[PDB]
């Protein structure tokens, strides 16, 4: 099996002499065939912060990773890497990674404090931002890497397991695994886009940590998978939190398209930063469009039922169910973040509060419907899932108007049961 050089959101040449090396929320990096050499351009979405630049590539870099402080470049065959800080204050540095016979660099990644290189023989090489090596590790063959601060998310491949992943932290002292080669339930690719799958056999369009620090991956099925509960080995789950095919379907007014595609850049809280590619190919072109935003949605909407109720309009009852699930998941993730790592951006506490609010609100709409359908049992189950004591109160009032005295007594039992726990 042939390992291909991976970079987040990279594109193939196709029939042109240019392509994107890598791409995320910070910006995009392109390379152009310049006779016998290459012309690399590094661009930014925040034109105010950084200044777009270019340089001549005499090595043929086919690996790249972009962060907010610098850009990492790699050459899969010769093993030469280069790190270029965005500011001119800090110096560039170059290194050559040792490579055995047939060994290729398959993926590189960099944070403000770490530089990572992965190979097809499973060599895992780490450095600081200045090129000082920390330790060489031997793992399963690496196919894709991403990183954030001191944490690394790595994807591995064997002939035995298929795809697996590891999640680690590169601390000051040693490397620690949160997760070591666990199953990666990303669908593999099963044609007009054949150039892409020759370029990216695994079909991993991109992968990254979320802004709040949760690992994400985006495969050929165009579903955003987020890893939940990764701090607890026995509780970790991959969650599909966005069917981008379904969102495009909804955007097109319930019509099947073939010319609109999603290219993933990053996940910011509840919003997928992406490129909307209009055209025959599924990867972005030149010039690169402005980034779009796609709010994540739990995959609980059915096309046939959405058609009956008619951009597609969503029935308030069906919308409340998805909003309940989405709020539930995001709340659980964010709370886990705050209970272990604390804040990063400064608004997490406020985001979590609004999140729980949205949760109970959507839950109460479901409670209302259940009361409207005289479904006392289902209504009580919904009530148990409420967070705020103020929401339980509102539920009582709804039960009263619905004239459901048996429900009121059982919900009031919940309130008293919680008040009793408050006395301990």
């Amino acid at each position: 099996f042939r390992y291909m050089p991976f970079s987040p959101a990279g594109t193939p040449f196709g029939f042109t002499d240019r392509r994107y090396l890598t791409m995320n929320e910070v910006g995009y990096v392109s390379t152009v065939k310049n006779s016998e050499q290459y012309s690399i351009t590094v661009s930014f979405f925040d034109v105010g912060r950084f200044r777009e630049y270019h340089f001549e590539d005499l090595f043929g870099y086919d690996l790249c990773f972009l962060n907010e402080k610098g850009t990492l470049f790699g050459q899969s065959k010769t093993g030469q890497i280069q790190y270029r800080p965005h500011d001119s204050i800090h110096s560039n540095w170059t290194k050559i990674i040792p490579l055995q016979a047939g060994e290729r660099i398959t993926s590189v990644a960099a944070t403000p404090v770490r530089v990572i290189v992965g190979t097809s023989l499973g060599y895992f090489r780490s450095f600081n931002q200045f090129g000082v090596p920390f330790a060489v590790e031997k793992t399963s063959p690496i196919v894709a890497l991403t990183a954030q601060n001191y944490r690394v998310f790595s994807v591995h491949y064997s002939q035995f397991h298929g795809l697996s992943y590891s999640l680690s932290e590169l601390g000051t002292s040693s490397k620690r695994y949160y997760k070591r080669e666990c199953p990666l339930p990303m669908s593999l690719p099963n044609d007009a886009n054949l150039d892409y799958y020759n370029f990216n056999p695994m079909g991993i369009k991109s992968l990254f940590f979320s802004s709040y620090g949760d690992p994400c991956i985006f495969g050929s099925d165009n579903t955003l998978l987020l890893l939940s509960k990764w701090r607890s080995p026995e509780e970790s789950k991959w969650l599909p939190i966005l069917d981008s095919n379904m969102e495009i379907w909804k955007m097109s007014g319930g019509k099947e398209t073939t010319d609109i595609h999603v290219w993933p850049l990053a996940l910011a809280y509840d919003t997928l930063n992406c490129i909307l590619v209009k055209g025959k190919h599924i990867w972005p072109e030149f010039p690169l469009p402005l980034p779009s935003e796609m709010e994540i949605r739990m995959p609980v909407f059915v096309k046939s039922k959405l058609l009956e109720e008619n951009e597609i309009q969503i029935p308030v009852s069906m919308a409340a169910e998805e909003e309940y699930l989405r709020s539930k998941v995001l709340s659980e993730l964010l709370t886990d973040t705050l209970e272990n790592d604390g804040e990063m951006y400064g608004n997490e506490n406020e985001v979590l509060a609004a999140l729980n609010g949205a949760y109970d609100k959507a839950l109460l709409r479901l409670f209302a419907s259940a009361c409207s359908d005289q479904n006392v049992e289902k209504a009580l189950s919904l009530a148990h899932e409420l967070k705020q004591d103020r929401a339980l109160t509102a539920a009582v009032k709804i039960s009263e108007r619905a004239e459901l005295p048996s429900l009121v007594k059982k919900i009031n039992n919940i309130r008293e049961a919680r008040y009793e726990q408050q006395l301990k």
Binding site: L364, A368, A394
Partner: peptide
């Protein structure tokens, strides 16, 4: 129930 729901929202 819109009045109770609306009452909860604010």
């Amino acid at each position: 129930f819109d009045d109770i729901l609306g009452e909860f929202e604010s």
